[PDB]
Design a binder for this molecule. Structure first.
Ligand SMILES: *[C@@H]1O[C@H](CO)[C@@H](O[C@@H]2O[C@H](CO)[C@@H](O[C@H]3O[C@H](CO[C@H]4O[C@H](CO)[C@@H](O)[C@H](O)[C@@H]4O)[C@@H](O)[C@H](O[C@@H]4O[C@H](CO)[C@@H](O)[C@H](O)[C@@H]4O)[C@@H]3O)[C@H](O)[C@H]2NC(C)=O)[C@H](O)[C@H]1NC(C)=O
Length: 361
């Protein structure tokens, strides 16, 4: 089983204990660690943070301790304009230029592969995404002729049915990618004023519309569209989403005035790291949707949808029963990496839990 774990560049800037460098990563925890995110300048892959070259090296030294550990560099991300990707992929001239610049870059910094994070291609992009993947793989296969281990090629893909139909040719790209990560944790919709869980495992025996907004349907749909199970990776969030309540109503369907207040270390409205959530739990009321099998907590006017060891183990078992390639975690720096916030002195509580399930048959 594969355990794909993302590490984010900007987490180094968080104050105090929040700060996280490749350094803190347990080499034997994951099978793959993906660095986020690489950028594109003059149609060529390039670094993002001033010190990426230093962090790249730090990250890849972990391979001295665990010889089997594989690393990948991810291109794109949310702060990377979708249009920018769209523009590079439409012109065969800029696409070939970008493709050619990747292998040497990855080779120089010691990466085993490339992860595509185009978020997201629109209806007019589907064709071009296919060409990018096909050509990128062809270039990787060609470079392997030089007597070196072929670079890996993966992609982070939306888990929303509409988003999938609109910009992805799943049957086509599945045959060229090494693995596919399903972003099964952006299910609730940042668009409207209502309390709801962003990473429901199951549909919910109790609310008709939007049965497509849960991991179970996303996986079933990808398998139906032709993505082989042995290439699908289910994404598991290590963060939580917050909301500020517009009323004293805490139960499902409760009015929302906006995003929850920022966390001490995370400093971003609407989200909280799991270690920030562990501190939040004190004096908070804990609830759990029986149908979706995911928890949520409330304190004052703050409502938080998140994942704990049990909901995460739950998702892992589901992943196994459907015989998928494995799990993907977003992200290592949002889990209790120091292991000093969430009671149990255990390091990476959430990611370890996923690993326990994957290691037992
Ligand atoms: C990820 O990679 C991307 C892609 O390279 C980086 O994005 C782009 O970075 C450039 C440079 O920082 C920004 O473009 C500016 O380009 C010139 C100034 O840059 C040149 O200026 C002169 C030549 O004109 C030269 O001496 C310099 O050495 C340098 O090469 C500006 O003219 C240009 O100014 C205007 O910006 C307006 C926006 O307010 C536009 O309307 C105008 O058309 C005009 O370009 C521009 O500011 C870009 O901002 C940036 N993305 C683009 C091109 O949209 C990116 O920085 C990198 N990310 C990170 C985190 O490093």
């Amino acid at each position: 089983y594969k355990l794909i774990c993302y590490y984010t560049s900007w987490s180094q800037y968080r104050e105090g204990d929040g700060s996280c460098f490749p350094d803190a990563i347990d080499p034997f925890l994951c099978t793959h660690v993906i660095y986020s995110f690489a950028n594109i300048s003059n149609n060529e892959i390039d670094t993002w943070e001033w010190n990426d070259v230093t962090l790249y090296d730090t990250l890849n030294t972990l391979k001295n301790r665990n010889p089997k550990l594989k690393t990948l560099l991810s291109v794109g991300g949310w702060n990377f304009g979708p249009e920018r990707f769209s523009k590079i992929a439409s012109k065969t001239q800029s696409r070939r230029t970008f493709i050619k610049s990747v292998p040497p870059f990855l080779r120089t910094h010691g990466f085993d592969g490339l992860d595509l994070a185009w978020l997201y291609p629109g209806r007019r992009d589907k064709r071009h995404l296919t060409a990018l993947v096909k050509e990128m793989k062809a270039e990787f296969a060609r470079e392997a002729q030089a007597g070196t281990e072929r670079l890996l090629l993966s992609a982070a893909v939306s888990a929303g049915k509409i988003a999938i139909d609109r910009g992805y040719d799943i049957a086509q790209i599945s045959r060229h990618l090494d693995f596919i990560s399903l972003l099964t944790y952006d299910f609730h919709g940042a668009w409207r004023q209502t309390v709801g869980h962003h990473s429901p495992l199951f549909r919910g025996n109790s609310d008709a519309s939007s049965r497509f907004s849960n991991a179970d349907y996303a996986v079933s749909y990808m398998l139906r569209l032709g993505a082989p199970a042995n290439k699908l990776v289910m994404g598991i969030p290590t963060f939580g989403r917050s909301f500020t309540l517009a009323s004293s109503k805490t139960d499902v369907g409760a009015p929302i005035s906006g995003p929850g207040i920022p966390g001490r270390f995370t400093k971003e409205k609407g989200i909280l790291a799991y270690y920030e959530i562990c501190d939040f739990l004190h004096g908070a009321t804990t609830h759990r949707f029986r149908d979706q099998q995911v928890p949520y907590a409330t304190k004052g006017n703050q409502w938080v949808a998140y994942d704990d060891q049990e909901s995460v183990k739950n998702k892992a078992r589901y992943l196994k029963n459907r015989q998928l390639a494995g799990a993907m975690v977003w992200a290592l720096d949002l889990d209790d990496f120091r292991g000093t916030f969430c009671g149990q002195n255990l390091t990476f509580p959430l990611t370890s839990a996923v690993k326990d399930v994957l290691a037992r048959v």
